[PDB]
Write a protein that binds this ligand. Structure first.
Ligand SMILES: [Ca+2]
Ligand SMILES: [Cl-]
Ligand SMILES: [K+]
Ligand SMILES: [K+]
Ligand code: NA
Ligand code: NA
Ligand code: NA
Length: 182
């Protein structure tokens, strides 16, 4: 309380966040006694553009939400002093994969086309059937192709049940239970 505030630093200094994701900013107060203090909950936060929304709800103080791709300047203000930083919003990232059909009954000797829908960090979606790698837990029940022009093509090779899944980098679809009948 004896110390006067002399500066505000906002961290991080450079950062990238995917569209639809969020970032917690920190406001660090610098004082005449050379102490540093977390003043994130005390400062006034603002953003230079709609592309990053500073969240207003209690407990969200200093949280920015990526609305649109671009460059945004962020400011923390207290006692007419301001600290600033820059953030970059990058394109939405793959967060989940939904495969269809969710379950299926296939007659042996027939072929069924599975599709993979990528769900992104802004909850946009895309057909990524040809981009994913398709997997079968048991080729003796069904095979599934990754061959160009046949991606997601599942062929009933024998009776039973099998797990079908799609993967793309570190993202994996839910398992689809494929039953093959005679
Ligand atoms: Ca900074
Ligand atoms: Cl940046
Ligand atoms: K806003
Ligand atoms: K997933
Ligand atoms: Na600003
Ligand atoms: Na915008
Ligand atoms: Na069989």
């Amino acid at each position: 309380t004896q110390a006067t505030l002399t500066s505000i630093e906002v961290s991080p200094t450079r950062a990238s966040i995917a569209k639809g994701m969020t970032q917690k900013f920190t406001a660090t107060g610098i004082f005449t006694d050379h102490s540093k203090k977390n003043i994130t909950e005390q400062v006034t936060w603002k953003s230079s553009s709609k592309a990053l929304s500073m969240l207003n709800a209690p407990g969200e103080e200093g949280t920015g939400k990526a609305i649109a791709v671009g460059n945004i300047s962020i400011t923390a203000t207290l006692e007419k002093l301001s600290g600033k930083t820059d953030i970059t919003v990058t394109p939405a990232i793959l967060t989940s994969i939904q495969i269809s059909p969710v379950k299926h009954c296939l007659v042996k000797g027939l072929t069924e086309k599975f599709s993979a829908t990528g769900i992104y960090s802004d909850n946009s979606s895309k057909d990524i059937t040809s981009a994913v790698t398709w997997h079968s837990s048991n080729n003796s029940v069904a095979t599934i192709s990754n061959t160009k022009g046949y991606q997601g093509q599942a062929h009933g090779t024998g009776t039973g049940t099998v797990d079908i899944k799609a993967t793309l980098g570190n993202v994996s679809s839910a398992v689809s239970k494929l039953s093959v009948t005679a």
